[PDB]
Structure formats: C-alpha cells, structure tokens
Design a protein around this ligand. Structure first.
Ligand SMILES: [Cl-]
Ligand SMILES: [Cl-]
Ligand SMILES: [Cl-]
Ligand SMILES: [Cl-]
Lengths: 116, 116
C-alpha cells in the first residue's frame, strides 16, 4: 500500500511491546503503568492519543483470577496466555501516524525502561 | 510478533510515500529531493539513518529513458510503473525504530509538503 500524505482515511499502527520483567525482576511495571484506579494509563492514553493496554500473563496481578478467567474460556480473556506486554494502538492521519506512534512508544518506554 | 525493547535484531520499517504532484502541480519535487548530483538525498540519507529512494513514473525526469528502461523489462527498473513516490526504509533497533522512521518521515515531509 501507499502512504498518502493528503489522505482522509487514518492508518493504524499496533505494537505489542514486551514488559521487560527479566531485566527488572523486582519492578512493579503493572502497578506503575496502570496507576491507582487505572488513572495513569488513562492519562497516558489521553496524552498520547493512542490506545494502550496491559495484556498477557501478569496483567491482572492475581494468579488466581487469571487462572479462573483463562480457564473460563471467554475470548476477551484470551490475551492472558500471551507474554506480559503493552499493546499500543494508534489510529491516525497518515502524515501524523508515525509521529503519534513514536510519541506513544517514547512515553511507554518511560515506564518499560524506567532507569533509562 | 512482539517488539522487544532489549533485542539485538533490528526491525525494518518501510513506507512508500506518494509525491503529491496533484497538490503542487508546478513543483519540481524530484529535482529538490535529489539535488545537484544526487547530493541532497545523499545528505538526507546520511542524516536520517534511513534508505530513501525516489521511485516510480517521473523519478528519472526523462519520459524517454523511462519508456526505454521500462520496456527493456529489466526488473531493476520495475518501479517505473508505480506512482511517483519516496521509498523510506529504516532498519534499526526495536527501541529506536519508530523514532528513526518518524524522524525520516519528518525530514521527507519537509520536501513533500514543502509549504507546510
Ligand atoms: Cl534480582
Ligand atoms: Cl509486574
Ligand atoms: Cl496549477
Ligand atoms: Cl516532479
């Protein structure tokens, strides 16, 4: 496909960014990213223009609930077998979509490489 | 696939950005982008870290040579039937690849939306 700088249709970008638990074994990535109340990831989404979701084994921080929901077989909880990760989905005008996503990646990198 | 911020393999991004000739009917996009001698696109590549190539109908600015080369059937000149466009190819570390590409898109947008 072509990227048309003058187009009205928005193009999507999606990345599933692993959460580097092995590199930061004691770091509560999930707590940090979500926030009290889910407020952080709310602000994070508001600020970046992007849809950001923590998904995968670990995301609920409740081995029990996760087992139960995975086992229940509901497809919304399907993500629970994936590696813990952050799912960034921008949907924006072609001229701005890489800027959006790079922004979003920058912001997310702030939590995922937190000492850097 | 997953984006792993700590990975050694570089991920590729590629976009074929149309050159907006209809929006700028008298603007010598090809001249501007390439430069005397191909020097501009050389500097442009050096600066952005990316592989940038002008391709498609128009790219050689020589309807003759283009006809001949297309007709010759050599597959290197295959691009000559495509819409005139700029082919941006970054190949960089996952943590930096969207930044690279966004950079490259910014720089290219400078020529392709030249009044903006
Ligand atoms: Cl440790
Ligand atoms: Cl965690
Ligand atoms: Cl005109
Ligand atoms: Cl032109």
């Amino acid at each position: 496909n072509y990227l048309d700088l003058f187009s009205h249709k928005n193009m999507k970008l999606k990345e599933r960014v692993l959460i580097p638990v092995k590199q930061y074994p004691k770091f509560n990535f999930v707590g940090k990213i979500l926030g009290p109340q889910g407020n952080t990831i709310k602000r994070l989404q508001e600020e970046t223009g992007a849809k950001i979701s923590v998904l995968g084994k670990g995301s609920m921080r409740d081995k029990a609930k996760e087992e139960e929901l995975r086992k229940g077989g509901d497809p919304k909880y399907a993500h629970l077998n994936m590696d813990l990760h952050v799912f960034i989905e921008v949907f924006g005008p072609p001229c701005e979509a890489y800027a959006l996503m790079a922004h979003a990646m920058e912001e997310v990198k702030k939590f995922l490489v937190p000492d850097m």
